[PDB]
Amino acid sequence: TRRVAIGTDHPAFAIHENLILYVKEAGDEFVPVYCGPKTAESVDYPDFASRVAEMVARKEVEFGVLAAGSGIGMSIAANKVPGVRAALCHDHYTAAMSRIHNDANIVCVGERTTGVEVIREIIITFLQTPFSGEERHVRRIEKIRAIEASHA
Template identity: 55%
Template sequence: MKVAIGSDHAGYEVKEAVKALLDEMGLEYEDWGTHSSESVDYPDFASRVAEAVSRGRADRGLLICGSGIGMSIVANKFPGVRAAVCHNAETARLSREHNDANVLAIGARTTPMQTIREIVRTFFRTPFAGGRHARRVEKINRLDDVWSDRRMTSEKIQ
């Protein structure tokens, strides 16, 4: 599994710590920045990671900003990306099992480092459950098709 990872200035130090955890887990990753704690705009880095996932250059993504919210909003603009802000291991597990989330967003300012480690381990080790959840994820994928084509017809959504 290849992971695209990125952060803004608020998440930079946590991102560096998480990279060590990804190494421990044996996961390959590519760091899309930022590469310092100097103030930057989170959409620039969230879009790099989301594009890598959307285009298949990475299997999963990991985004870290102050709250995780801004980066998740940006990531979810990209076709095929299902970004989830996770606050604990349980939300990470459910995001993978039920939603087949492929991008994890974490808040560096809102989540203790030990909890972040638990979230990351859980997110990258939990498989998608499939079953009834596959039908629901397929409906999300159809919405991607509709909106990315800029055709907003109700018959395509149903």
């Protein structure tokens, strides 16, 4: 079982059912855990970025998906949580690379910027693409951890 926590802001609430489906489409082993808003009313993205990011950081779920207007705010807020590597992706290539290079554990998307079929492709690619495990990538990821440690 590979659990995937999902969070959104208000505009992306309209596609939260989409996001749940797209996670399931990546494979039977992928289990969506919806942690976003329950209504379409205005919320603050950092509150939902934080909820999902903490779950990833505490090893409660393997992955996170954050969808908002542009995804920029989501990516900034999520990355403030130690242990999180949150990747704002806009296409298949970035989705794949975020995993291959960065062993990213959260994918961020913009509902106002990226069409839903490309969001679908991003989520499936993100979840299916394995980390390369190559020496230089492992070293660089360790250096990110070291930046975290220096500010804790």
